[PDB]
A paper describes a structure:
The replicative DNA polymerase from the hyperthermophilic archaeon Pyrococcus furiosus (Pfu) is a member of that polB family and is used extensively in biotechnology applications including high-fidelity PCR. We had previously used polymerase evolution by short patch compartmentalised self-replication (spCSR) to discover variants of Pfu with a dramatically enhanced ability to incorporate Cy3- and Cy5-labelled dCTP and replicate Cy-dye labelled DNA. The resulting variant E10, derived from an exonuclease-deficient version of Pfu polymerase (with mutations V93Q, D141A and E143A) and with additional mutations in the conserved A- (V337I, E399D, N400D, R407I) and C- active site sequence motifs (Y546H) was able to efficiently PCR DNA while completely replacing all dCTP on both strands with cyanine labelled dCTP (Cy3-dCTP or Cy5-dCTP) giving rise to highly-fluorescent products, termed Cy-DNA with applications in advanced microscopy applications. In an attempt to better understand the molecular basis for the altered substrate specificity of Pfu E10 polymerase and generally gain a better structural understanding of the primer-template duplex recognition in this class of DNA polymerases, we have solved the crystal structures of the apo Pfu-E10 and a Pfu-E10:DNA binary complex at 2.4 Å and 2.9 Å resolution respectively and compare them to previously obtained structures.
Pfu-E10 displays the domain structure characteristic of DNA polymerases, consisting of an N-terminal domain (residues 1–130), an exonuclease domain (131–326), a linker region (327–369), a palm domain (370–450 and 501–586), a fingers domain (451–500) and a thumb domain (587–775). The electron density is well defined for the N-terminal, exonuclease, linker, palm and fingers domains of both molecules in the crystallographic asymmetric unit, but some parts of the thumb domains are disordered. The final model for chain B is the most complete, but is missing amino acids 612–614, 669–675, 693–695 and 757–775. The two molecules (chains A and B) are very similar (rmsd of 0.8 Å for 690 alpha carbon atoms). There is a slight difference in the orientation of the thumb domain, which has a slightly more open conformation in chain B than chain A. This is likely to be due to the different crystal contacts in this region. The structure of apo Pfu-E10 is very similar to both these structures, with a superposition rmsd of 1.0 Å and 0.9 Å between Pfu-pol and Pfu-E10 (molecule A or B respectively, 685 residues aligned), and 1.0 Å rmsd between the Pfu-PCNA and Pfu:E10 Chain A (694 residues aligned) and 1.5 Å for Chain B (715 residues aligned). The greatest difference between the three models is in the thumb domain, especially in the region of residues 679–730.
Numbering used by the authors: 1 to 611, 619 to 665, 677 to 688, 724 to 757
The structure:
Amino acid sequence: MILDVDYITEEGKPVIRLFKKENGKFKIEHDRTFRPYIYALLRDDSKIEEVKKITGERHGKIVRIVDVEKVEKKFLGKPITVWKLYLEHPQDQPTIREKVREHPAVVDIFEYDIPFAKRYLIDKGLIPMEGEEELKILAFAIATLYHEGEEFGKGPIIMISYADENEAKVITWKNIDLPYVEVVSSEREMIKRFLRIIREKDPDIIVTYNGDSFDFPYLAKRAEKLGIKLTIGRDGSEPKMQRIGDMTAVEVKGRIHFDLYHVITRTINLPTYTLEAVYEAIFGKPKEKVYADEIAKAWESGENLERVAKYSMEDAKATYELGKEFLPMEIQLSRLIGQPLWDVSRSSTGNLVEWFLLRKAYERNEVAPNKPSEEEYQRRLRESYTGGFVKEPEKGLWDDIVYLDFIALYPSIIITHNVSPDTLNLEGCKNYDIAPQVGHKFCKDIPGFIPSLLGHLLEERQKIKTKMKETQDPIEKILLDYRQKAIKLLANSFYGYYGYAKARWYCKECAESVTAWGRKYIELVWKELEEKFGFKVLYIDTDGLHATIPGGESEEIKKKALEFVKYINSKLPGLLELEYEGFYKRGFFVTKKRYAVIDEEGKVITRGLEIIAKETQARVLETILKHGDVEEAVRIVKEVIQKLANYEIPPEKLAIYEIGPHVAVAKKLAKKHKYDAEYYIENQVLPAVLRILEGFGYRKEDLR
């Protein structure tokens, strides 16, 4: 399988290198056949003779066009002729662009700024991470001695921990009595040990959490001071710092450095992205945290190093376990987009769509649009985008609530109404659909570029999903599930990509229309559900609705909802489709994006209603949702505020674990005095509880 691809310069010529793994053996395949190029669109094709001899410059040398070739291409569907100007080196493209474009006969040039290594994979039709191979994965993390606001690297590396399928160990240079700790002469030898472990294990993928920014640079500066080369690459090379956007990543030749931090960021949203939080959110079970001050005290003492060696071992053990869960997802992406995992895992979802479309463009013989200019880029970043329909909810405490929503709404709209730049207001178009309120017309004679790709993606997902019912092989079933996750993520990225400033296939009109159509069909369901079925819609947001039959029986509401989805789907066009998603026993709605519901199992879901103060507002939700008693909830608030004045509540519950609030905290460096009360009522209890009770017409006066 193809793991990575770069290129090196030999005697002025570009040489591609395909880093591979085949039959459990590593090999590098060189390729000197490929040639970089750019496209030229001319007024007059006879003027090509003048364009052929246009000269450029680089490092004082003379850069010229080595070959030219006439080719038929498509541009936004419409046929077009272009000249393929070949060059010696990829780095000749900027200078040849500058001067070829200045020619009066040349109208524009295209596909001039695609990196050479990625150009090779697209053109050769090479997809990385294909086939079945036993890839060896290894994770690692490091513990450092921090002291003072000091330079990055002055503190010695206290521990280097690592973990794989078989084991999880710690390498250090102090006497510790643990069975997974390995003691060594000094820091220098600790680093040399780590190099031996990487050498013996010889991993295909090295996994870190935040390795680009912290672990590799800190190891490198340390290794520089100690006079020791980091022979981590499979050709003995050191880790190389490389840039992409506003990020400096770390590269390892022969292997794939997989930094987990970048994959978790664009996927799920959390308050903070610590290694402990991410582990708990994913796996459920908790992970203890040891802090810098605890490490600094225990290290210089010589005792209490068992606690730090535990934390360091678990850092490596957790990173491996997270890596094992997110890597199979990411290899399917890289296999779906068709670029290497090093790049794909550090790419934003908008840029992953770009690399997908550039590959597909080549399969369809179609010329890509250029990146926007700096003036065009800043223009797009200024414009605003109108969101989905949100309704001001019906207030009060409601019973037996059904939630209905659309399946893949925006993708289904893009396919049904053929929404893309190449079909926008097409000249000489026979049959077209008009977007509501915005009036943009999309041609439906031929399926466009993006709508056709997306339609195929959703087809392939259904095949995988159907085959998953059938399969009994657990390895296949889990493989299919990731393939299905990868396609889904990629498919939901297309909407956002249309409004993405940097995108080549940018189309605000397409994005306006997708949102506009979404608002039409949500309101259609709203009208059809309240008139023909007699329901009362409680709240609507973007692609889903909460509703019920006020005072109606629980079992009847479910039945009439399951009937409505069958009905409404007969009216909805193409891929548009509604589904029965869930049922709730009770629920109330304060305002937009602010509500709380409760399922039949008693589990209480919330949104917008967030942070003794956290305990009370949780106790308020329970008495409202479980028992349906708003008056009882008010008594609880009156009881809690009374305990604050009389101090009947115990200590510690009033404490907060974290120039500002830390004025008295800075002094601590080296039964009584329980006076705080007004603070806990005004700043903590009321703001949390009022957020809920405002919907039922209560004020600060009622509580206080």
